[model samples]
Target chain A: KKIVEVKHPLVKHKLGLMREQDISTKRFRELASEVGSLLTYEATADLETEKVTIEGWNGPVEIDQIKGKKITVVPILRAGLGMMDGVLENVPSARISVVGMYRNEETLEPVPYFQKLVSNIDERMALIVDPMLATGGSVIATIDLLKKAGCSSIKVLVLVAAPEGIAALEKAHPDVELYTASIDQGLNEHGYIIPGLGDAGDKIFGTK
Target chain B: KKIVEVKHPLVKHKLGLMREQDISTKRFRELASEVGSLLTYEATADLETEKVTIEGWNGPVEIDQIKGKKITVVPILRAGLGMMDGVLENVPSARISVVGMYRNEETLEPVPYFQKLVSNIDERMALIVDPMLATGGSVIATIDLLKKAGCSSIKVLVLVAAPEGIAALEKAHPDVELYTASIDQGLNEHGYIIPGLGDAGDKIFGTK
Candidate 1:
């Protein structure tokens, strides 16, 4: 797996603000989406573009259009939903594929509950988004489903990740590319990534 | 009330696209946010700014920062949530004030169910966002609550508005300014804007 730790001034600055212990739900949500958009800019840099002529304000103009199938954003519900708008900021026409996965309490394994993928997902580039990659169970399970459905082009975007999570993802799917804002220290005893944004779902939804 | 119908090309183009009958949930939602962001640029043009020296990539540089109390975005849920991210795209640090108002089916009056406003709202500029302004019951009620709580500086942003809605808002709170993509023709028999995007909340949340 190719691991990309995004290095941009705005991303770094926003990530720093998100690290605050008492950041409000509103701020955290905004930062998550903003960083998601910046990460998307980095992730889609190599998308193949073809020159196309279109009527411009003056006359015929050549514009580079993204070639082939439209991209589908697969946001792992519900924390991933926080970053969905950010990705849509750049790729407004991208279809949303909502996926819900819960970790089984006893086994700590991912259990998929809900999925609403768009048609022709197999022909599209899947941009999977989740806030944190702690143990990689949910992401791995999501990718497993996507691949089984014939989606070959997949990229994962996250805000933070732990070494163990990255290792597991690398071992599970060596072909997938991963992009994240920060690689935190490691996982804690309670399965939380140490020094990572704590409970992104709760922070996003103001649940807990 | 000062009325601003944004005339930017991008806003116009997006709004035109949104007027289609069969627009998808994802497309409509994205257009709402994009037009919201563009309206934000026009609405915030006169915000007071102060010159402050900050360290730049090279050395000390002076930059204009929006001065005074931070902005508070009042998004009357759940349609308003569609535009909240657009306001945040420009003002990332702006606090969010989520308000839920249900239109009483029989009376055509708005009933507030929830409101969580940021502190010191009296000092902040409240940017009120809702996608459509048809009967204008919810927007007027929201402004009434904001003013009752001592919020004096308020601005309204919407995707489309009917003359009736604008007239009602003007009569109700002439102090607040209004910004929209289009001042639509008029309202229909069922209190829907004639050519406006139908049931913004339903389209945004994909509920109906």
Candidate 2:
């Protein structure tokens, strides 16, 4: 239901660099993961913290720890793997749930081929990540599966999102939250977000 | 020539957690990269900076950018890929040079299998990253290869280092600096460092 586009200066600067056409594959991949980390910082800002005692270097010390639910990062496969490291940067203990899906060219429908969800999904918060939210079919389908698996708390993180995709996601799952680096103008006729990093998967993998 | 064992509390804490035998594959991979980022911070403290003007959010502004030599991250592959992202977190524009080598079980010598160095490597600072320094053959061989390629400025980064490895490296190439999370105890009979991460490559890639 809620959308938060990060406005931090570092995120803005790095995302701007990624727009350059001549950027190297290595650089693009690095920025994608870096932006993922910044978005994660924004997405987890309100996580409840409780005081806990732990053994410190000197002695017993009270510390603030993230309370309650554990986190399981759901990175949409291929392109999503690029951002998984960024989420891990902040939450090293989070489990990984790799979901693979591809949209059908003819019908623009998502086709799921593989998924490895973590056990006890209902007890943990799921942070689903993908680089682009173009048609929203893939993301929505992923959410549908997670819900079927009884995951009640879900958050979506993406590098770029189109207005059309946002609208579609809002209608499909208004209860889930979304975080992104940028919300571009809209999508082009070919179902690609305009002025967006083109074919993030290809750029990240150095493939044609 | 120089050796820096980072003592940042966060670095120490993460390294400690990584020593647990029951740590998950995802968790170990995350800590490896996290510590890599911290070591990068300490390693680049003396990097030369130059003033440069860039377009700011409002108007033109001057920023201090890393000057002179560009950077190339040399990750002795397989396990080294785990630490490469941490270096990229600080220097995203750095070119990646993936190097693959293996120790011959019979002779305990490193055999180079693959390499892809960036152009103008002679002018760039090479940061060679590997998770553990057990015998130092791989690191030493990597340094030998870089020198043969005309790369003069080299620095080594590792998560843990054994005294034997450090001594061997110093004898082989006394000029290159080294940065690490911890300088652990000596190596065991099986060539694994005592109190060091066990089988770093296996832990990193989740293989046997």
Candidate 3:
């Protein structure tokens, strides 16, 4: 009930071009950000707005403004940084909350290695954005960390989501909503989504 | 009319936050990009689309795609580069046409110092972008150069537009359409847009 696979025509067209086998790094990066923006448009359609008086070009003017604290965009480190520009494209005034995760060698559990959350994040809508949601470990761990700090207003945005990851996320945090471009078939034996864009982080950063 | 002063509530609220004298470089830069995006939404509303069959996740599906040669984003260097990301937020596949200009001391006329227009630009729509339209000299020179290259389809997008600049552009290139966040009262004595976002280049780059 808390998932949205955006079926917008523009979203589908852009996603289709991104599935090519030999896309350039520049092209991949561009599409990654664009998809983030398209998903953001869908995610923010229900944002609360209130009328506020401001000094416009023509003196005092009443304008509709997003209510309460500025929304915070939480990018889950390196790969997530690729989609940061996309989220910022719409929510320019939103604060950035950077989070990084590393798996514990013994437990094989993802642990937070870096986190610089925006101040008063509890009051802000934390829109977590990343290019891919493969295993859901990275995102779920980030959510666990955020909830530990009392941030209840949370939503996840990704370019693509795997059913395995969606199932994992729902079991962990059923309250959080997931917005994705496509919920692809399933994961390969290597934990990669079939017919997926292939190692989104590598494609985004031009790394092997 | 060939000019559009966007009246969207989000555009006004974001632009309003940008006018403060004490606004930080980061804040100003963010607002600049955001307004560029909001303006792009208005600018691309009338774009032509065509239906084409693409390999969808489900099966062969007909989807609407932008028609004709890919649109080209013409950023007038430095400040314009800030808005480049904004335009790309919508048209991710669009090629970039970088343009730079300088004022000749003897002639007091702006001269093109650099231009890297995309190939086949003549067949693509050129959406020229810059942060502030104060004197309009830079944009006029860029448009002049673009036209000389047989580029007939051209549009201009700016964050703020001064009346003086609008009048100047209308006289020189009345055929081109303009999309802007605000057509400010007029330019100040120093050729700055009155109550403008200050020197956008400096704000964008966090310099000076």
Candidate 4:
């Protein structure tokens, strides 16, 4: 599986945090964004761009720019939303789309029920974001939909990933670049990572 | 006086940039602290203890409660050394301490020499971070010195007054508080305020 690991002082500081079991949901959310912002900075380092004349402290100067090619950021509802601000803090011009889906407690299978992507997906670069990838079902299904909608240039970002999900992503879409902060050991009987941070969506929002 | 006013929907929508022009350096510095951390939530809002007995998903857990008064964030020297992070994003427990100083180009008024703030000034609450207030030279100065002494009761926050010079601060000191956010105004002839951005030293590092 293709994976990108971010190694920055601040990034490490934040990650060293959420790894602890006693971390609070509030702190987790904060560290998540902090990490996200840093990762986003790395992802956009080589993004296409063109120099444009703009105002600067010294005077009018030509600076590197983003050669926009329909860049879109889609956060997989709730949990994924936590990472959205981090990406936007850097890529302020990108469009945002919300995709909502969850696992069926009984079946443990991915289920699709909502979609709110408002860009011309066929021509835009799709950025699918989710906090955890316990089971690959959700990402697989979402990727399927994006492909069906004619989005070939798709990239997926997650705060954490597991072996099972990573395998699913690679098997399903070998070309999709995977960006994650950490990839833990594996999953547990309940499909949660052996040492996962618990329900990310609920914890991120501080909801019961 | 040269002035830069950023008025945009997202900028205002975030936390309503201080709605004034002649903001005090101290206040402007405060605003920088809050704004820098605005991307995340108030993760440190209810910090009350360091190691608390908290109930986790499994059992009663003991973890870092992140007490509001326990934090150590120092902005190096001159012009607040680090980024504003912004006013709305100010962190709790964050403190300030000036490291270096600068004399007015013409008036030759000696400014702070350096700043070394305590890590957490509240418990260590955020350090006294007001870096710029022009004539409020000693605001960031006193803070930086306190940081070196491991003083937690100190916070040299700024409010960006019209850089009226040292005499102004002699009276304004009584008005200065422990926490504040500053806005941009211009500097004046005697290194005072003139619709200035105030002194950026404290705004950037600690001294100004």
Candidate 5:
């Protein structure tokens, strides 16, 4: 498992400020977009490409392939959408898929409500975006869905993470990559990451 | 009268696409952001802020503002909102105000609908943003309204413009700075810029 701790100063400072504020939904959405833009620069560093031969004045010439790899980004419903624009601003041609799931208040398991995805997921690289990775139950379920849908290469991008979730991912899906800003201590009884982003989806969309 | 033609290739290309295509609302919103981000880079080339003394001083402070100018951005309603994120992303500390207007098809005049402006506007530099500058009626009316509200140091930002509108602006508000992507040949019979973006608000919001 490759743990890439993004060391960009702006990312660190912005993430800190975002986690420690009574931020309005609009501001939260703004910060998420900013952060997404920063992460995108790092995430697509080696996007798959091929060299193609083109006609030149004298002979054939080789140039980098213009066609991007088939890429898919899924944000676990509401919270994930906050980060999508940030990613898409960099990778504008990517195919977007949305998955919905809510943690059961009593059982603590993911209960998916909505999903809209393109078929033949096996051909694409998938990135599951969820802002806070507290217990990993939702992420675990999300990845399970993606795997069942035939995703070949999968990465999990989370802003905040905890040991419990890391342990779960390590135990169940050790092949997946996890990208996060900072790993926190533990989860509160209500399943929020301590000193973590509060209800990221709500703060992002202003619905609540 | 000086006209600053924004000279970025991406800006020109996107502005051209916006003018010729039958674009949807989402496309309008996305393109506006792209253009706004490009302009922010050019506009901030001369900011000059003050340096502040920090605690436990180690070296000379190097903080500064943008060329000693007090900056504010006021966008015309609906389509203008699409451009706000890009501008604010670059000018994070800049103050914001809102101006709203809609054109009357029969009279071919811009009519005021809503506004929430900050007082002391003359002391601050203001930029008025609207995506399509067609007949120049709304453009002139908007400036008149801002002048009534005490906005003396003002400029205009538009994604697309018409020759008639640019000529009208020079004739009416020669002193005001005008920044735009590309000026079209002329206005259509309906007073829309020829090859202009088709109804920016309707396209941006996906409305018919």
Candidate 6:
């Protein structure tokens, strides 16, 4: 019930291309959002609907809109930002809460290097996005930050996942649900999931 | 259907907000992009697919990708750029063909001020994107240029279309299919589509 992998043909095709070693930055960044929005559509399809009024071309029209305010998409920094546009494609009004975590060399504890959460985040659903979920390190830190701020509803959408990271994430935050395009194999010696996207952050940002 | 109006509930919901006079710049820009993405879904619904082999995690996997040569989204200058991300949400590898038109005071004809087209555009489907099809001057001019350059397959995507603009576009280029969020009333005396977003170019960029 906690982890669901998307196996639709379009989803598989897009994910398959990203797995290619020769994928360009533009192509990778593009598929990243393609899958991001595809995942958003499936995840939020069950929200309740409400009636709202708007000025139509001929006259005032009452429309049934998704009963919601603004879910906050807390993009976990760097690679996370790539999926922000796609997430917003579904919920254009959602507030963006950017969070980045780093480790303290002395204490060996993960800490927030950059964080800006929306006010009243506790009342809103937080959908965290990232291209790859090789390990549950920064993701767990992000959840801790969200729960501490009184967030009651949360969901995570990752393009690819590792079983080890999924298990760790569940152990840390059992209440949250995760959706991914595919569940990748366990991590390699260098901490990368086997046949994984090498350095999604670098590929997305073209930083290197 | 030469002029297809998107009537999906989600499409109409996003279009409703753009008509509000008091809407924020940020809100309008985001909605513009949302509608752009939605319209893209409708326009490409009939695209054929072909089998392609890509490297998979375990071995070579066969996948069906969009069966076609390259596609270039020709954004009409500043306003067109706003919807670039949305269009790419569906087709990320599309070459961006940026174009702009200026009036020749002496000759009273529209001129291309800026143009950067990808090679072999004739073999590609040209998705020309704009926020409003009010007067249809620029859209037609862009189409003319595209055809002159041997682009036979061209489609136009706009957030809102006016009767006058749609008529002119149809008369000028009947072969090209036009998809829009909605077909609004005729244009006003000053050349603005009634019930349309005010100066979409300005609102999108917040330049004014």
Q: Which stretches of candidate 4 lie over 4 Å from their true place?
A: A19-21, A56-59, B1-82, B86-95, B107-110, B113-116, B119-208
Model 5 ranges with Cα > 4 A deviation: A53-62, A66-68, B1-208
Total clashes in model 1, counting residue pairs 3 or more apart in sequence or in different chains:
0
Model-by-model DockQ, in order? 0.06, 0.07, 0.12, 0.06, 0.03, 0.17
Please give, for residues B1-208, the per-residue lDDT of candidate 4 as tens digits: 2122222222222222332334455555454544334322222223343445444443443434343443554443545443445422333324434355566667645565544454544345444344445665555445436544655443334434443533454463442333323243445456654433434554344443
Worst 10 residues of 1 chain B by lDDT: B199-208
RMSD of each: 7.9, 9.0, 6.8, 10.3, 10.2, 6.8
lDDT of 1 by residue, A83-174 (tens): 97789888877766767776665677887766657666678999999999999999999999999888999999999999999999999999
Real contacts recovered, all predictions: 0.03, 0.08, 0.13, 0.00, 0.00, 0.23
In model 6 chain B, where is the ten-residue run with the lowest total lDDT?
B101-110
How far does residue B14 in candidate 6 sit from its true spot (Å)?
3.2
**Candidate 1: residue A145 Cα off by (Å):** 26
lDDT string, candidate 5, A1-208, tens digits: 6655577899899888797567765677778878877776676665767899999899999988645455777778657867877876776655566677777768778888656554568877777888888889999998988898888688887888888888888788988888777788888888778878887865664332
For candidate 2 chain B, the 10 contiguous residues with the lowest summed lDDT are B199-208
- Which regions of candidate 3 fall more than 4 Å away from where they truly are? A7-10, A25-27, A54-58, A61-64, A102-112, A206-208, B1-12, B18-33, B42-67, B72-85, B92-208
Q: Write the per-residue lDDT of candidate 3 for residues B40-154, one digit (tens) a residue.
A: 7667767776777656433454545777899899998888888876677677678998998754535545677789999897788899999888878988999998999889979
lDDT of 6 by residue, B4-36 (tens): 997765677678777776678898888888888
Candidate 1 stretches with Cα past 4 Å from truth are: A1-27, A30-208
As for TM-score, the candidate ahead, 2 or 4, is 4
True contacts kept of 2: 0.08
lDDT of 5: 0.74
Clashes counted in candidate 2 amount to 0
Score every model by TM-score. Answer: 0.59, 0.57, 0.61, 0.60, 0.52, 0.63
